């Protein structure tokens, strides 16, 4: 209904991905060789501009989503209207605990399976001395 925490996480992921996309497109257009290649007639630059436009659309929709989530965050001002900045320096959850215990049991089971898989998977280290 609110998902403000997930909204902030998505916004952070989006701005990080925007920076990543900037770096990637710089690395991409870095080796922009002569379009009129001696050997290559029309091969490279086509896919180059294709990926260029793709990354452009990507960063455009990224900016759009950023603006949208920022507007959503700044509009839904519910809870702690004062919001004391000086309140960040120190001097039911039953279902959560049940899900955590179930996940831990599944993790231990998977770990036992992986432990068995270790011995079942080495399988060559002991007998590579005479393997062919």
């Amino acid at each position: 209904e609110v998902n403000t925490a997930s909204l902030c996480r998505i916004g952070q992921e989006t701005v990080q991905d925007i920076v990543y996309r900037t770096m990637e497109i710089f690395q991409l257009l870095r080796n922009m060789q002569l379009p009129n290649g001696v050997t290559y007639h029309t091969g490279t630059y086509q896919d180059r501009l294709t990926k260029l436009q793709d990354n452009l659309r990507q960063l455009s929709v990224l900016f759009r989503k950023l603006r949208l989530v920022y507007d959503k965050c700044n509009e839904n001002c519910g809870g702690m209207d004062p919001i004391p900045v000086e309140q960040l320096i120190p001097y039911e959850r039953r279902e959560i605990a049940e899900v955590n215990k179930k996940l831990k049991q599944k993790n231990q089971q998977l770990k036992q399976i992986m432990d068995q898989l270790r011995n079942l998977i080495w399988d060559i280290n002991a007998m590579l001395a005479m393997r062919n």
């Binding site: 992921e13 990080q16 920076v19 770096m23 710089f26 257009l29 922009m32 002569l34």
Partner: peptide, 26 residues
């Protein structure tokens, strides 16, 4: 124009070495 763009992209990529990606995931 091509030479200037190439030099610019190279310098940008070089200085962008100090990235700000806190993690690498979905």
């Amino acid at each position: 124009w091509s030479n200037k763009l190439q030099y610019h992209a190279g310098l940008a990529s070089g200085l962008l070495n100090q990235q700000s990606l806190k993690r690498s995931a979905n």
